[PDB]
Every structure is written in C-alpha cells, then in structure tokens.
Design a protein around this ligand. Structure first.
Ligand SMILES: [Cu+]
Ligand SMILES: [Zn+2]
Ligand SMILES: [Zn+2]
Length: 104
C-alpha cells in the first residue's frame, strides 16, 4: 500500500497531513508538496529505530521543496527496522510541522 502525506494542509496550515501514519513492511510513504512551501523532511539520528544516524540520514530529504506537486517517497521494505520514524520540516519547525511513521 502507498500512503500519501500532504506537505501543507489544503487550508493553509503548516502541517503534514496525516501527521501520523502506520505502515507495514513493503508499504510506501509518499510526500507531496501541497501548500505554503518550502518544506523538507528531516529525521534526526535519535528519532529512528536504534538511533542510527546512517539510517536517518539516508531517509532525510533535507533539500527544500517549493513547487506544488513535488514529491519524495520511502518504501519501508522488510529490510527496514520496525518502530517509529519521527520527522520534521525545518522551515516550519516552529509551527510544529512534524510527523511520525510507525513501521509494523
Ligand atoms: Cu514545512
Ligand atoms: Zn541529532
Ligand atoms: Zn500489524
């Protein structure tokens, strides 16, 4: 299954929608740039399973997305550790533009 997460609410809120997504191994999360850019998608090293910086860095999309419809996806294949992957948008961090992917 692919779960889409809007970056920016349709109504002009600096939020990921849905902020929390539960996925199973093999599922994909697709972020779509919707409203109020720029956005990015950052996982801190201590915010992924096992606190792996290698993993968190590979998954982070630190570059800023400005154009509507720009996208980034992660397929949480069976080779990903189960657990929570908590992320945030740096440009809108102060607005609480955060989310969490729970694998399994
Ligand atoms: Cu943002
Ligand atoms: Zn850190
Ligand atoms: Zn389950």
């Amino acid at each position: 299954e692919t779960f889409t997460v809007k970056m920016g609410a349709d109504s002009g809120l600096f939020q990921f929608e849905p902020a929390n997504v539960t996925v199973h191994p093999g599922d994909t999360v697709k972020w779509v740039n919707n409203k109020l850019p720029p956005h990015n998608i950052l996982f801190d090293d201590k915010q992924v399973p096992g606190a792996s910086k290698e993993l968190a860095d590979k998954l982070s999309h630190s570059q800023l997305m400005f154009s509507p419809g720009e996208s980034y996806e992660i397929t949480f294949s069976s080779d990903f550790p189960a657990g929570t992957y908590t992320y945030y948008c740096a440009p809108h961090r102060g607005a609480g533009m955060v989310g969490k992917i729970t694998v399994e």
